[PDB]
Design a binder for these strands. Structure first.
Length: 96
RNA sequence: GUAGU
């Protein structure tokens, strides 16, 4: 459909872990899992990742806040787009 | 080191 039962999280500090994110988002409702975009060329993440949920009612609750705060830095939370947007027509953070 | 593994 139009969205996954998962959020995008962008602007993450280099100090912030996948477990920091997974334990943080649990304040709104139950978290299924989390992942950050790791690069083996440096062993750091690409400054963004994803968080999967128990319910899309939490995905909405979290996305309505839009700007969150982790390790004394701010992060942007958005609905995870359905991977078709990884095409060169949408990979520049685009929408249909 | 803000649009995927």
């Amino acid at each position: 459909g139009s969205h996954m039962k998962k959020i995008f999280v962008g602007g993450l500090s280099v100090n912030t872990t996948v477990e920091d994110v997974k334990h943080y988002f649990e304040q709104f409702g139950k978290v299924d899992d989390a992942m950050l975009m790791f690069d083996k060329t440096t062993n750091r993440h690409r400054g963004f990742g994803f968080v999967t949920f128990e319910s899309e009612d939490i995905v909405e609750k979290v996305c309505e806040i839009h700007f969150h705060e982790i390790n004394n830095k701010m992060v942007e939370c958005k609905k995870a787009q359905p991977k078709e947007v990884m095409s060169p027509t949408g990979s520049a953070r685009g929408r249909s």
